[PDB]
Design a protein around this nucleic acid. Structure first.
Ligand SMILES: [Mg+2]
Ligand SMILES: [Mg+2]
Ligand SMILES: [Mg+2]
Ligand SMILES: [Mg+2]
Ligand SMILES: [Mg+2]
Ligand SMILES: [Mg+2]
Length: 157
RNA sequence: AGAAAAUUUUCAACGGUGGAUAUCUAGGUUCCCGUGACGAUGAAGAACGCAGCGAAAUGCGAUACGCAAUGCGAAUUGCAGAACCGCGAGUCAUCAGAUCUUUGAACGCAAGUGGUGGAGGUGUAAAAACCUUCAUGUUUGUUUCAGUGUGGAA
């Protein structure tokens, strides 16, 4: 399980990398949480994810639209539909936390970390069964995650 | 030029899915040559067992991954403990002597049963319990026999 991040940061003493692999969270959901985190401040990402968890804010749905509920919360976005994929958020959040603690040994400051490169990949699907009428059986699976995120320090003048 | 994103889409790089391709092989396949060599002295097959730590596969049978003999002459090894430098190591080979549970042509009778007869041994005051033994056909004989079968002396 050695992570190869597809994209690399320009300054690696100035960067922080996290990845988790072969997760059990829903792909599409995770995908969109992440897609929503890109390009923010680590502190912001954390606040806003916590806020999604507390339901006071929505995680926009971008790529996977299939019949997703419209909320007023989607105003923040320009969107109609979004949700609160709690499990995904919690996992991602844990990843951000690994980012911050991952900055510790580097002696880097949190305030100026910015998130560039979230990557969510469809992992090997976990397999099981579903019994169907007439004695048919159909697949019942889960689509797992690979996630990686790196954070750059950018100084604000 | 609703000249930003999202979606739809072309191309590349990297990553993910996936296991194609290439290169291998204690395998297969076919050809030629050599031996035919199982069994009531209980075969082929079946059951259950047997390692200090073992399920399988392979070996083995209460002497149970093995005894003996012989040849190699120092290992086994995943762990632990011993044994051995030749009084000889070994998961080595060879193999001509042994061990060979319950079965199965399967055999006292019977059987989805470790059930149950007779004879002998044992055990006991007498028992129980344990042990050995008994299938059918056939060729000779041995012994004991039957037949208003054929003969037949005193
Ligand atoms: Mg990985
Ligand atoms: Mg059903
Ligand atoms: Mg590829
Ligand atoms: Mg020896
Ligand atoms: Mg007879
Ligand atoms: Mg007569």
């Amino acid at each position: 399980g050695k992570t190869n991040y597809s994209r690399e940061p320009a300054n690696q003493a100035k960067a922080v990398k996290t990845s988790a692999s072969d997760l059990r969270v829903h792909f599409k959901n995770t995908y969109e949480v992440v897609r929503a985190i890109k390009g923010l401040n680590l502190e912001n990402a954390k606040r806003y994810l916590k806020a999604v968890i507390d339901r006071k804010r929505c995680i926009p749905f971008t790529r996977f639209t299939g019949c997703i509920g419209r909320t007023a919360q989607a105003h923040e976005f320009g969107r109609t539909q979004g949700r609160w994929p709690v499990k995904s958020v919690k996992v991602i959040l844990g990843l951000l936390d690994n980012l911050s603690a991952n900055a510790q040994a580097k002696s880097l400051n949190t305030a100026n970390l910015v998130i560039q490169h979230g990557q969510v990949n469809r992992a090997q699907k976990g397999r099981r069964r579903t019994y169907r009428a007439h004695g048919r059986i159909n697949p019942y699976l889960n689509s797992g995650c690979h996630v990686e995120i790196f954070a750059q320090e950018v100084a604000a003048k």
